[PDB]
């Protein structure tokens, strides 16, 4: 049996930072993707970032050039979101996700298998 086991959310404040690690364990295939989502309140879900076991990470969702970061550990099969500078539209709840094919894909229909998703709440600054 495949698992995704998110872990590293929660509630932080504007300008912070937080790491989500997704691990994979059952997994069955020599390749992967590797994905996160983000479904933020009222909006459909989007990609946020990929890697695979063949290429290097990317963040699909605009951002700014150091917003997000996605890298892995190959040996503890675990992908790793890095969030820094975070702003109130970043609330969403997180969802690793994974998929043989090992090009890099933003589609959600994609994608087979499912973490049980993360809540990330970013407080907002006073004003």
């Known amino acids: 049996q495949v698992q995704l086991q998110e872990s590293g959310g929660g509630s932080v404040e504007a300008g912070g930072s937080l790491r989500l690690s997704c691990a994979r364990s059952?997994?069955?295939?020599?390749?992967?993707?590797m994905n996160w989502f983000r479904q933020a309140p009222g909006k459909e879900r989007e990609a946020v970032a990929g890697?695979?076991?063949?290429?290097?990470?990317?963040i699909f969702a605009e951002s700014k050039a150091g917003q997000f970061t996605i890298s892995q550990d190959n040996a503890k099969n675990t992908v790793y979101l890095q969030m820094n500078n975070l702003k109130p539209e970043d609330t969403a709840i997180y969802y690793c996700?994974?998929?043989?094919?090992?090009?890099?894909?933003?589609?959600?229909?994609?994608?087979?298998?499912w973490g049980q998703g993360t809540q990330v709440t970013v407080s907002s600054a006073a004003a």
């Open positions: 059952g997994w069955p295939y020599s390749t992967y993707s």
């Open positions: 996700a994974a998929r043989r094919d090992y090009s890099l894909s933003s589609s959600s229909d994609d994608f087979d298998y």
């Open positions: 890697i695979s076991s063949t290429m290097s990470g990317i």
